Design a protein around this motif. Structure first.
Motif, PDB file in Angstrom:
ATOM      1  N   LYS A 192       6.150  -6.491   5.271  1.00 48.18           N
ATOM      2  CA  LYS A 192       4.854  -6.066   4.618  1.00 48.18           C
ATOM      3  C   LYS A 192       3.739  -5.875   5.723  1.00 48.18           C
ATOM      4  O   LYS A 192       3.024  -4.661   6.006  1.00 48.18           O
ATOM      5  CB  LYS A 192       4.395  -6.749   3.616  1.00 48.18           C
ATOM      6  N   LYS A 193       3.383  -7.023   6.516  1.00 51.40           N
ATOM      7  CA  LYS A 193       2.546  -6.973   7.518  1.00 51.40           C
ATOM      8  C   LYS A 193       3.034  -6.100   8.717  1.00 51.40           C
ATOM      9  O   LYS A 193       2.208  -5.475   9.381  1.00 51.40           O
ATOM     10  CB  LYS A 193       2.313  -8.552   8.026  1.00 51.40           C
ATOM     11  N   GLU A 194       4.482  -6.084   9.070  1.00 51.81           N
ATOM     12  CA  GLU A 194       4.905  -5.392  10.138  1.00 51.81           C
ATOM     13  C   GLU A 194       4.570  -4.054  10.231  1.00 51.81           C
ATOM     14  O   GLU A 194       4.084  -3.330  11.013  1.00 51.81           O
ATOM     15  CB  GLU A 194       6.352  -5.563  10.192  1.00 51.81           C
ATOM     16  N   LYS A 195       4.737  -3.291   8.795  1.00 52.28           N
ATOM     17  CA  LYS A 195       4.301  -1.856   8.648  1.00 52.28           C
ATOM     18  C   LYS A 195       2.961  -1.822   8.901  1.00 52.28           C
ATOM     19  O   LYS A 195       2.513  -0.661   9.273  1.00 52.28           O
ATOM     20  CB  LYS A 195       4.907  -1.449   7.373  1.00 52.28           C
ATOM     21  N   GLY A 196       1.989  -2.695   8.631  1.00 53.23           N
ATOM     22  CA  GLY A 196       0.646  -2.696   9.335  1.00 53.23           C
ATOM     23  C   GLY A 196       0.569  -2.990  10.617  1.00 53.23           C
ATOM     24  O   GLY A 196       0.562  -1.976  11.468  1.00 53.23           O
ATOM     25  N   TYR A 207       0.744  -1.427   0.012  1.00 50.20           N
ATOM     26  CA  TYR A 207      -0.094   0.033   0.052  1.00 50.20           C
ATOM     27  C   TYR A 207       0.839   1.334   0.076  1.00 50.20           C
ATOM     28  O   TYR A 207       0.521   2.307   0.668  1.00 50.20           O
ATOM     29  CB  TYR A 207      -0.973   0.011   1.327  1.00 50.20           C
ATOM     30  N   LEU A 208       1.835   1.347  -0.744  1.00 48.79           N
ATOM     31  CA  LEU A 208       2.987   2.306  -0.791  1.00 48.79           C
ATOM     32  C   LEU A 208       3.934   1.934  -1.960  1.00 48.79           C
ATOM     33  O   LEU A 208       4.397   0.725  -2.023  1.00 48.79           O
ATOM     34  CB  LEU A 208       3.541   2.704   0.445  1.00 48.79           C
ATOM     35  N   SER A 209       4.290   2.834  -2.874  1.00 48.02           N
ATOM     36  CA  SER A 209       5.001   2.732  -4.082  1.00 48.02           C
ATOM     37  C   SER A 209       6.270   2.133  -3.622  1.00 48.02           C
ATOM     38  O   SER A 209       6.904   2.129  -2.451  1.00 48.02           O
ATOM     39  CB  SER A 209       5.306   4.316  -4.681  1.00 48.02           C
ATOM     40  N   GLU A 210       6.722   1.395  -4.595  1.00 49.73           N
ATOM     41  CA  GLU A 210       8.160   0.620  -4.587  1.00 49.73           C
ATOM     42  C   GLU A 210       9.384   1.438  -3.774  1.00 49.73           C
ATOM     43  O   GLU A 210      10.257   0.824  -3.152  1.00 49.73           O
ATOM     44  CB  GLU A 210       8.627  -0.306  -5.558  1.00 49.73           C
ATOM     45  N   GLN A 211       9.271   2.717  -4.470  1.00 52.07           N
ATOM     46  CA  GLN A 211      10.303   3.571  -3.912  1.00 52.07           C
ATOM     47  C   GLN A 211       9.999   4.029  -2.057  1.00 52.07           C
ATOM     48  O   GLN A 211      10.840   4.233  -1.482  1.00 52.07           O
ATOM     49  CB  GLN A 211      10.718   4.728  -4.776  1.00 52.07           C
ATOM     50  N   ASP A 212       8.755   4.531  -2.090  1.00 56.77           N
ATOM     51  CA  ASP A 212       8.290   4.898  -0.932  1.00 56.77           C
ATOM     52  C   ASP A 212       8.450   3.830   0.350  1.00 56.77           C
ATOM     53  O   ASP A 212       8.630   3.982   1.314  1.00 56.77           O
ATOM     54  CB  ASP A 212       6.602   5.338  -0.865  1.00 56.77           C
ATOM     55  N   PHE A 213       8.312   2.551  -0.195  1.00 53.87           N
ATOM     56  CA  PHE A 213       8.384   1.277   0.473  1.00 53.87           C
ATOM     57  C   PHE A 213      10.019   1.269   0.803  1.00 53.87           C
ATOM     58  O   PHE A 213      10.022   1.573   2.179  1.00 53.87           O
ATOM     59  CB  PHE A 213       8.027   0.165  -0.484  1.00 53.87           C
ATOM     60  N   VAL A 214      10.840   1.471  -0.002  1.00 56.37           N
ATOM     61  CA  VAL A 214      12.350   1.635   0.143  1.00 56.37           C
ATOM     62  C   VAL A 214      12.604   2.607   1.424  1.00 56.37           C
ATOM     63  O   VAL A 214      13.466   2.412   2.395  1.00 56.37           O
ATOM     64  CB  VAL A 214      13.027   1.617  -1.027  1.00 56.37           C
ATOM     65  N   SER A 215      11.909   3.726   1.140  1.00 58.65           N
ATOM     66  CA  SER A 215      12.222   4.799   2.145  1.00 58.65           C
ATOM     67  C   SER A 215      11.728   4.315   3.832  1.00 58.65           C
ATOM     68  O   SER A 215      12.447   4.752   4.639  1.00 58.65           O
ATOM     69  CB  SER A 215      11.508   5.932   1.835  1.00 58.65           C
TER      70      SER A 215
END
Length: 36
Positions: free
Chosen positions: A30-34, A1-9
């Motif tokens: 992925k789940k942990e950010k949730g 639920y966040l762009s592959e780059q925003d993800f990296v950030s």
């Protein structure tokens, strides 16, 4: 639920290293950010 780059950030890794990491560690992050 966040762009592959925003993800990296937010994730503190790379798309490359993530795709190398175990599928469990991948889904875990992925789940942990949730909420796990």
């Amino acid at each position: 639920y966040l762009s592959e780059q925003d993800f990296v950030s937010v994730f503190g890794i790379t798309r490359g290293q993530f795709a190398a990491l175990p599928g469990w560690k991948q889904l875990q992050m992925k789940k942990e950010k949730g909420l796990f």
